[PDB]
Amino acid sequence: MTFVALYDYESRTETDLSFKKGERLQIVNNTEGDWWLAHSLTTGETGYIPSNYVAPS
Amino acid sequence: MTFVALYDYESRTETDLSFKKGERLQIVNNTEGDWWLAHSLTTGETGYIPSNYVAPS
């Protein structure tokens, strides 16, 4: 439900949240799912993906 | 381990991976953890956060 930031984090893109240690955060439900860092065996490209867009082999 | 893309996805930032339905993807281990959409109760701002930076209340 509710979480506390353990460290400062500075945003690197337009979509991430900057926060300071000690902030209280609540998880937002959304249709994309959690995001995972992934490597495409098909294209060789690498980056974050929305987990609801994929399924186990 | 290995996953298959169920849908096309077009990148929206410099860090996400674009992929087509059918691509084979493998999860990359990294120090940040999975990313979650979160709302800061402290600042009112909202965006994605690295899960390894937070802990349950």
Author numbering:
A (entry chain A), B (entry chain A): 84 to 140
Give the article text.
All the crystals of the dimeric form of the c-Src-SH3 domain belong to the hexagonal space group P6522 and show a single chain of the c-Src-SH3 domain. The intertwined dimer is generated by symmetry, and the structural motifs of the SH3 domain are formed by two polypeptide chains: residues (N-terminal)–111 from chain A and residues 117–(C-terminal) from the chain belonging to a symmetry mate (thereafter, chain B in the intertwined dimer structure). 3D-domain swapping of the polypeptide chains occurs as a result of an open-like conformation of the n-Src loop (Asn112-Gly116) which acts as a hinge loop. The same arrangement is found in the Q128ED. At the distal loop and diverging β-turn, the hydrogen-bond pattern of the dimeric structures resembles that found at chain A of WTM and Q128EM: the residue at the position 128 is linked to Glu106 through the W1–W2–W3 water molecules network. Besides, in all the dimeric structures, the hydrogen-bond between Glu106A and Ser123B side-chains (or Glu106B and Ser123A) is conserved with an average distance of 2.8 Å. All the intertwined dimer structures described at this work show the presence of a PEG molecule at the interface of the two chains forming the dimer. Whereas the WT did not show a large pH-dependence of the Tm, our results confirm that: (i) the mutation of Gln128 to arginine or lysine, which bears a positive charge, results in the stabilization of the c-Src-SH3 domain, since these species unfold at higher temperature than the WT; and (ii) mutation to glutamate, which bears a negative charge, results in the destabilization of the c-Src-SH3 domain.
